[PDB]
Write a protein that holds these residues in place. Structure first.
Motif, PDB file in Angstrom:
ATOM      1  N   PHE A 175     -15.765   0.691   2.539  1.00  0.00           N
ATOM      2  CA  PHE A 175     -15.412   0.650   1.125  1.00  0.00           C
ATOM      3  C   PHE A 175     -14.609   1.893   0.763  1.00  0.00           C
ATOM      4  O   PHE A 175     -13.547   1.801   0.154  1.00  0.00           O
ATOM      5  CB  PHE A 175     -16.677   0.566   0.269  1.00  0.00           C
ATOM      6  N   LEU A 183     -17.433  -0.398  -9.371  1.00  0.00           N
ATOM      7  CA  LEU A 183     -18.491  -1.122  -8.696  1.00  0.00           C
ATOM      8  C   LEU A 183     -19.711  -1.241  -9.603  1.00  0.00           C
ATOM      9  O   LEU A 183     -20.299  -2.317  -9.734  1.00  0.00           O
ATOM     10  CB  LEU A 183     -18.843  -0.408  -7.389  1.00  0.00           C
ATOM     11  N   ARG A 201     -18.968  -3.759 -12.252  1.00  0.00           N
ATOM     12  CA  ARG A 201     -19.040  -5.115 -11.713  1.00  0.00           C
ATOM     13  C   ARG A 201     -20.494  -5.549 -11.498  1.00  0.00           C
ATOM     14  O   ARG A 201     -20.870  -6.677 -11.815  1.00  0.00           O
ATOM     15  CB  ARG A 201     -18.238  -5.247 -10.416  1.00  0.00           C
ATOM     16  N   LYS A 229       0.834  -1.211   0.000  1.00  0.00           N
ATOM     17  CA  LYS A 229       0.000   0.000   0.000  1.00  0.00           C
ATOM     18  C   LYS A 229       0.864   1.255   0.000  1.00  0.00           C
ATOM     19  O   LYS A 229       0.529   2.229  -0.678  1.00  0.00           O
ATOM     20  CB  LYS A 229      -0.983   0.046   1.180  1.00  0.00           C
ATOM     21  N   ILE A 263       1.982   1.728  -3.645  1.00  0.00           N
ATOM     22  CA  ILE A 263       0.918   2.075  -4.582  1.00  0.00           C
ATOM     23  C   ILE A 263       0.458   3.516  -4.434  1.00  0.00           C
ATOM     24  O   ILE A 263       0.031   4.153  -5.402  1.00  0.00           O
ATOM     25  CB  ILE A 263      -0.314   1.184  -4.354  1.00  0.00           C
ATOM     26  N   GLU A 274     -20.537  -8.475   0.760  1.00  0.00           N
ATOM     27  CA  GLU A 274     -20.977  -8.071   2.091  1.00  0.00           C
ATOM     28  C   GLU A 274     -22.390  -7.500   2.026  1.00  0.00           C
ATOM     29  O   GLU A 274     -23.202  -7.723   2.927  1.00  0.00           O
ATOM     30  CB  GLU A 274     -20.010  -7.044   2.690  1.00  0.00           C
ATOM     31  N   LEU A 299      -6.270  -4.922  -6.514  1.00  0.00           N
ATOM     32  CA  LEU A 299      -6.746  -4.610  -5.171  1.00  0.00           C
ATOM     33  C   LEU A 299      -8.111  -3.925  -5.265  1.00  0.00           C
ATOM     34  O   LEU A 299      -8.992  -4.163  -4.441  1.00  0.00           O
ATOM     35  CB  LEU A 299      -5.756  -3.712  -4.435  1.00  0.00           C
ATOM     36  N   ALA A 300      -8.273  -3.067  -6.266  1.00  0.00           N
ATOM     37  CA  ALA A 300      -9.546  -2.379  -6.475  1.00  0.00           C
ATOM     38  C   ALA A 300     -10.653  -3.389  -6.800  1.00  0.00           C
ATOM     39  O   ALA A 300     -11.763  -3.296  -6.270  1.00  0.00           O
ATOM     40  CB  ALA A 300      -9.422  -1.337  -7.582  1.00  0.00           C
ATOM     41  N   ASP A 301     -10.358  -4.354  -7.671  1.00  0.00           N
ATOM     42  CA  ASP A 301     -11.329  -5.414  -7.980  1.00  0.00           C
ATOM     43  C   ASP A 301     -11.722  -6.197  -6.735  1.00  0.00           C
ATOM     44  O   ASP A 301     -12.889  -6.564  -6.556  1.00  0.00           O
ATOM     45  CB  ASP A 301     -10.775  -6.394  -9.019  1.00  0.00           C
ATOM     46  N   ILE A 305     -11.663  -5.153  -3.593  1.00  0.00           N
ATOM     47  CA  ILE A 305     -12.475  -4.288  -2.746  1.00  0.00           C
ATOM     48  C   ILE A 305     -13.924  -4.249  -3.225  1.00  0.00           C
ATOM     49  O   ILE A 305     -14.852  -4.307  -2.419  1.00  0.00           O
ATOM     50  CB  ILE A 305     -11.940  -2.842  -2.719  1.00  0.00           C
ATOM     51  N   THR A 306     -14.124  -4.147  -4.536  1.00  0.00           N
ATOM     52  CA  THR A 306     -15.491  -4.081  -5.064  1.00  0.00           C
ATOM     53  C   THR A 306     -16.194  -5.426  -4.900  1.00  0.00           C
ATOM     54  O   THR A 306     -17.391  -5.485  -4.611  1.00  0.00           O
ATOM     55  CB  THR A 306     -15.539  -3.622  -6.544  1.00  0.00           C
ATOM     56  N   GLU A 307     -15.444  -6.507  -5.098  1.00  0.00           N
ATOM     57  CA  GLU A 307     -16.011  -7.838  -4.937  1.00  0.00           C
ATOM     58  C   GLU A 307     -16.524  -8.023  -3.511  1.00  0.00           C
ATOM     59  O   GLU A 307     -17.657  -8.482  -3.319  1.00  0.00           O
ATOM     60  CB  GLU A 307     -14.987  -8.919  -5.282  1.00  0.00           C
ATOM     61  N   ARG A 308     -15.710  -7.650  -2.529  1.00  0.00           N
ATOM     62  CA  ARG A 308     -16.064  -7.802  -1.123  1.00  0.00           C
ATOM     63  C   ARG A 308     -17.249  -6.923  -0.725  1.00  0.00           C
ATOM     64  O   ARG A 308     -18.083  -7.321   0.091  1.00  0.00           O
ATOM     65  CB  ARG A 308     -14.853  -7.503  -0.231  1.00  0.00           C
ATOM     66  N   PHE A 309     -17.318  -5.731  -1.303  1.00  0.00           N
ATOM     67  CA  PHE A 309     -18.424  -4.818  -1.042  1.00  0.00           C
ATOM     68  C   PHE A 309     -19.735  -5.473  -1.458  1.00  0.00           C
ATOM     69  O   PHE A 309     -20.697  -5.497  -0.695  1.00  0.00           O
ATOM     70  CB  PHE A 309     -18.218  -3.508  -1.806  1.00  0.00           C
ATOM     71  N   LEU A 310     -19.767  -6.023  -2.667  1.00  0.00           N
ATOM     72  CA  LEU A 310     -20.991  -6.642  -3.165  1.00  0.00           C
ATOM     73  C   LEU A 310     -21.337  -7.923  -2.414  1.00  0.00           C
ATOM     74  O   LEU A 310     -22.514  -8.216  -2.199  1.00  0.00           O
ATOM     75  CB  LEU A 310     -20.918  -6.886  -4.677  1.00  0.00           C
ATOM     76  N   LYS A 348      -2.719  -2.201  -8.269  1.00  0.00           N
ATOM     77  CA  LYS A 348      -3.803  -1.337  -7.818  1.00  0.00           C
ATOM     78  C   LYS A 348      -5.118  -1.811  -8.417  1.00  0.00           C
ATOM     79  O   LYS A 348      -6.139  -1.835  -7.744  1.00  0.00           O
ATOM     80  CB  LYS A 348      -3.527   0.114  -8.205  1.00  0.00           C
ATOM     81  N   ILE A 393      -5.695   2.430  -0.781  1.00  0.00           N
ATOM     82  CA  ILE A 393      -4.945   1.995  -1.958  1.00  0.00           C
ATOM     83  C   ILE A 393      -4.847   3.077  -3.038  1.00  0.00           C
ATOM     84  O   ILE A 393      -4.448   2.801  -4.172  1.00  0.00           O
ATOM     85  CB  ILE A 393      -5.507   0.690  -2.559  1.00  0.00           C
ATOM     86  N   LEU A 414      -7.264   4.668  -4.464  1.00  0.00           N
ATOM     87  CA  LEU A 414      -8.369   4.569  -5.412  1.00  0.00           C
ATOM     88  C   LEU A 414      -9.409   5.638  -5.092  1.00  0.00           C
ATOM     89  O   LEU A 414     -10.064   5.585  -4.058  1.00  0.00           O
ATOM     90  CB  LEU A 414      -9.006   3.185  -5.321  1.00  0.00           C
TER      91      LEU A 414
END
Lengths: 119, 119
Positions: free
Chosen positions: B95, B113, B116, A20, A23, A98, A87-89, A91-96, A84, B102, B104
């Motif tokens: 989020f 997001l 995705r 981090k 980046i 969760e 890591l961004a992918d 983060i978005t995956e985990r958001f959806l 980056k 990072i 972002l």
């Protein structure tokens, strides 16, 4: 300094934190890193654990060593740009995921996020 | 079953999981819950730890007891609607904080997001 938790190996948390810093540009290309012992003192972490984190990063090409000169941050914009992105992918995956786990649909979640972003 | 980690007290992880089952409607109002011992066997968790989770939920009004009849899921749509709202706010907050960590930016994160979400 980062704060560590007990669910994941400490060395991997250190690797994640160092990535981090690279980046975000806190540490730039060719920047000289602490020795593993210096970093251990800085983080209040066992130097063996720090060494495992440095080995992980060197193996993946994010830092490199010069003989009798220590370790340095790799200069490779393409390499860090792709990190980056990954890591961004994640983060978005985990958001959806969760959101799904609390019954919050994608549309509602995105609207809430946009609202928060605009404050 | 949920899987537990070592960074947070187990009882609070159990409480969090039970709340999720109630918000998503897996467990509906007036549904009868397992006894603490039954739940301990189901989760492979110490029943003392389960009891602490049930006490947390009862204190906050998400479950209730009838004498010699065990514990039941509260029926209160307003109460669960507000819980879902608070959990949703927490998810969006994390989020944006993780994105910041990072490098972002909000705009980029939201676009990723949305992309995705539409696959």
């Amino acid at each position: 300094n980062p704060t560590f938790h007990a669910d994941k190996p400490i060395y991997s948390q250190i690797s994640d934190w160092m990535k981090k810093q690279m980046i975000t540009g806190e540490w730039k290309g060719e920047d000289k890193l602490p020795s593993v012992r210096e970093m251990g003192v800085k983080l209040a972490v066992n130097p063996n654990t720090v060494s495992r984190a440095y080995q992980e990063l060197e193996r993946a090409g994010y830092i490199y060593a010069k003989r009798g000169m220590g370790s340095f941050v790799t200069s490779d914009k393409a390499l860090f740009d792709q990190l980056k992105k990954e890591l961004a992918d994640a983060i978005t995956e985990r958001f959806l995921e969760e959101a799904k786990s609390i019954g919050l649909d994608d549309q509602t979640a995105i609207e809430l996020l946009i609202k928060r972003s605009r404050n």
